[PDB]
Amino acid sequence: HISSQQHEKAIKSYFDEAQTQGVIIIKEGKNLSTYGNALARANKEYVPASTFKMLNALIGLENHKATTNEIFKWDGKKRTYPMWEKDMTLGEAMALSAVPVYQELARRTGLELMQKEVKRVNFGNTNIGTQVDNFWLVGPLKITPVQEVNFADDLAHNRLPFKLETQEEVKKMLLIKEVNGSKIYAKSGWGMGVTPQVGWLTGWVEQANGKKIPFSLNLEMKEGMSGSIRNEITYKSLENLGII
Numbered sequence: 001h002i003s004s005q006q007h008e009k010a011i012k013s014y015f016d017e018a019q020t021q022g023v024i025i026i027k028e029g030k031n032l033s034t035y036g037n038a039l040a041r042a043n044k045e046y047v048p049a050s051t052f053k054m055l056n057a058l059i060g061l062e063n064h065k066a067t068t069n070e071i072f073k074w075d076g077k078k079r080t081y082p083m084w085e086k087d088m089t090l091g092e093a094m095a096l097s098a099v100p101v102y103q104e105l106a107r108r109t110g111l112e113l114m115q116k117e118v119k120r121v122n123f124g125n126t127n128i129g130t131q132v133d134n135f136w137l138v139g140p141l142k143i144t145p146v147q148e149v150n151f152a153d154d155l156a157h158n159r160l161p162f163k164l165e166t167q168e169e170v171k172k173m174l175l176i177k178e179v180n181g182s183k184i185y186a187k188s189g190w191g192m193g194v195t196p197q198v199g200w201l202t203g204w205v206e207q208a209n210g211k212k213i214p215f216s217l218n219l220e221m222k223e224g225m226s227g228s229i230r231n232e233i234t235y236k237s238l239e240n241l242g243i244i
């Protein structure tokens with residue numbers, strides 16, 4: 001069938017075509033595979049941006065700072081996007097990347113509990129600093145693409161140190177696509193408050209046979225670039241490798 005060389009060339013071209021620099025790590029069982037046009041990004045640290053929402057949710061639910069049915073009401077103040085000017089649950093906010101909701105959840109958790117929980121889960125460099133409501137957007141919290149795909153691997157298999165129910169609740173919030181009997185769970189991310197800007201799409205594919213294949217795409221976001229480029233390159237890569 002297809003040679004490794006051909007797969008590597010195809011996926012690298014997906015990043016080349018988007019005129020950006022990026023990498024996508026795929027994990028099968030315990031083996032990591034790095035693809036893309038800037039492989040060294042694999043072990044470099046970047047702010048997690050919205051990918052942190054996955055953990056924010058885990059923490060909030062576990063520590064009873066919210067429930068999956070609770071509706072977070074829009075305070076009526078102007079928001080970056082009109083789509084965020086509404087009342088939503090944690091899951092709706094996850095799908096809409098509604099930062100205001102997760103900033104409220106972070107504030108409910110509190111700096112002390114948050115630092116302690118991030119440390120406990122051993123997420124990235126585990127340092128949240130002194131600002132409980134923006135540490136995942138502008139630092140000091142950072143994480144590498146390898147750590148992100150491993151975090152996705154752990155959540156997909158319920159290995160994180162949270163009740164099985166909590167993990168299951170959050171995973172249900174991450175279904176973003178179904179393709180040929182395959183289900184794609186993932187959370188996107190875009191650190192716009194950092195330079196250069198980082199883009200993420202972390203999650204996993206659940207194949208019909210029940211096997212789960214974690215992944216983490218990480219690239220540099222540039223002005224005039226569509227957020228859906230993260231999704232397109234991820235889907236093309238996954239498909240080129242026969243994952244979906």
Ligand SMILES: COC(=O)Nc1ccn2c(N[C@@H](C(=O)O)C(C)(C)S(=O)O)c(C=O)cc2c1
Pocket residue numbers: 049050051080096097099134137187188189190191192227
């Ligand atoms: C305190 O900062 C602010 O007030 N603003 C913003 C403005 C946009 N933000 C994102 N991006 C989404 C979007 O813009 O549609 C994406 C779906 C592309 S992303 O994949 O989540 C975040 C997720 O990283 C976080 C923010 C914060």
